[PDB]
Design a protein around this ligand. Sequence first.
Ligand code: M5R
Length: 277
Amino acid sequence: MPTTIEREFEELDTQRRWQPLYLEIRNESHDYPHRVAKFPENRNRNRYRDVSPYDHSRVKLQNAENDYINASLVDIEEAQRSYILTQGPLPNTCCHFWLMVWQQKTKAVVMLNRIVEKESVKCAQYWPTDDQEMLFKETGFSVKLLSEDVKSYYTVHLLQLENINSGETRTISHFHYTTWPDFGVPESPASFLNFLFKVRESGSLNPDHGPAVIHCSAGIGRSGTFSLVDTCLVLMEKGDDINIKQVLLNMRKYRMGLIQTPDQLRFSYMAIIEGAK
Ligand SMILES: CC(C)CCN[C@@H]1CCc2cc(O)c(N3CC(=O)NS3(=O)=O)c(F)c2C1
């Protein structure tokens, strides 16, 4: 029979209620303090003045003079899942990004943007593209490209993250979705689901590892879409119904503006429907 989410989707589609439902979410999302992001010392650590992590859920850099990073811990207790959603690193925050990855014991970095989108740099080149070692002297980290697996719409880079201070190294999986435009959607629910199931298959979203770092340019539109679909598919496993609107409103309490367009909200519904099959 048509599932409850399938009927909710059919109702929104035939009644053309996507733009009003998105506006409902926007007006029902409560604002939370983000005073630390706005400190004058952190102005050069933010990529967008209107995108800030909340004080109650920001990720702190441990043992640092300035513990600030534009990253949020998004916890979904019910789904047994936590992520770090962050902006695409700036040239001066690449060292903080790698320090965060180490401290949080992250195993995978999920990248949903391209470095250059619509005539603008949306992210720094924070990982090496060749055999040259990329050095982050501020925090004491090295990154070396170990291998690259190129697919039509995504690439997986294996990276060696060296902590020079401790002499330890770790293998990080860098899942780069290369065909998801800024403020746009992936070309199909199947391509997004195949990429999502590749990240899951690696164990990087499990509780035996630290939270996976999900980023696009601002860390809210495409990262929000990816995270909602993944969380809703886990909540779906208990045979219950999910109020997608409420799960998104709950996620928006950890990081502001998750899902930036009504078409990204519609895509989240199609992907959750096809995923649960
Ligand atoms: C929190 C909210 C009120 C701020 C709303 N203004 C900011 C303006 C700058 C900006 C730039 C982006 O590239 C994007 N992305 C769109 C997408 O699909 N993924 S993304 O996060 O990289 C933004 F969402 C925003 C939103």
